[PDB]
Amino acid sequence: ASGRRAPRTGLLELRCGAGSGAGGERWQRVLLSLAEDALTVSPADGEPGPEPEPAQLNGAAEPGAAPPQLPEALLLQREVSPYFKNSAGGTSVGWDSPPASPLQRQPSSPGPQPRNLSEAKHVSLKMAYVSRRCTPTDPEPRYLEICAADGQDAVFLRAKDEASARSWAGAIQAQIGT
């Protein structure tokens, strides 16, 4: 028992390719905890408290996912897969370019340490402003952008649905339209 008035949340994506061009985006699924007067983002997960939770059973899942791409795992373990110690040497047998990478197991079960956002992104709804942008390609889900007056913030997300992202932006504007 801890409060009843729960804010509306929407599973949206989060970019992560800030640099200059647009050929290296590292988007990622995240949660948009939208409150009547507070927009808090999260890593598509919840906060651990006094209420523990058991592991998650999968069953059978063999490597085979081309469409989906999640970095932070191969970039670190790059000089480990292709042997070690007797791998260095730029003279011969320089085949250190694995065309494939069928390495994926244990999708969900243990309790690793999802490090990426750490702390949520709370944003007051008494100055900010939402806006539904669009992409040059426009696959389906419209672009969403919300700026906050608490340090010139600008959260860029990309919903999965069209009506959802549109209904979300507009609603974020309803609360922010105070």
UniProtKB/Swiss-Prot annotation:
Organ and tissue specificity? High expression in skeletal muscle. Expressed at intermediate level in heart, kidney and brain, and at low level in intestine, liver, lung and testis.
Record family assignment: Belongs to the syntrophin family.
Q: Which classification does the entry list for the species?
A: Eukaryota, Metazoa, Chordata, Craniata, Vertebrata
Modification after translation is described as: Phosphorylated by CaM-kinase II. Phosphorylation may inhibit the interaction with DMD.
Keywords of the record? Actin-binding, Calcium, Calmodulin-binding, Cell junction, Cell membrane, Cytoplasm, Cytoskeleton, Membrane, Phosphoprotein, Repeat
Name of this chain's protein: Alpha-1-syntrophin
Q: Which GO terms describe its biological process?
A: neuromuscular junction development; regulation of vasoconstriction by circulating norepinephrine
Which species does this protein come from?
Answer: Mus musculus
Q: How does it assemble?
A: Monomer and homodimer. Interacts with MAPK12, TGFA, GA and F-actin. Interacts with the other members of the syntrophin family: SNTB1 and SNTB2; with dystrophin protein DMD and related proteins DTNA and UTRN; SGCG and SGCA of the dystrophin glycoprotein complex; NOS1; GRB2; calmodulin and the sodium channel proteins SCN4A and SCN5A. Interacts with MYOC; regulates muscle hypertrophy. Interacts with DTNB.
**Which positions does the record annotate as the modified residue Phosphoserine?**
92, 97, 101, 108
| Gene Ontology CC, one term | postsynaptic membrane
Q: List the molecular function annotations (GO) for this entry.
A: actin binding; calmodulin binding; structural molecule activity; transmembrane transporter binding
Q: Where is this region: Disordered?
A: 39-67, 91-117
Q: Which domain of life is it from?
A: Eukaryota
Function, in words:
Adapter protein that binds to and probably organizes the subcellular localization of a variety of membrane proteins. May link various receptors to the actin cytoskeleton and the extracellular matrix via the dystrophin glycoprotein complex. Plays an important role in synapse formation and in the organization of UTRN and acetylcholine receptors at the neuromuscular synapse. Binds to phosphatidylinositol 4,5-bisphosphate.
According to the UniProt entry, where is the signal peptide? none
Domain free text: The PH 1 domain mediates the oligomerization in a calcium dependent manner, and the association with the phosphatidylinositol 4,5-bisphosphate. The PDZ domain binds to the last three or four amino acids of ion channels and receptor proteins. The association with dystrophin or related proteins probably leaves the PDZ domain available to recruit proteins to the membrane.
Parent-protein start and end of this portion: 2 to 264 of 503
- Give the UniProt subcellular location, in the record's own words: Cell membrane, Sarcolemma; Cell junction; Cytoplasm, Cytoskeleton
Q: Where is the PH domain?
A: 5-177
Q: Which gene encodes it?
A: Snta1
Predominant subcellular localization, coarse grouping: membrane
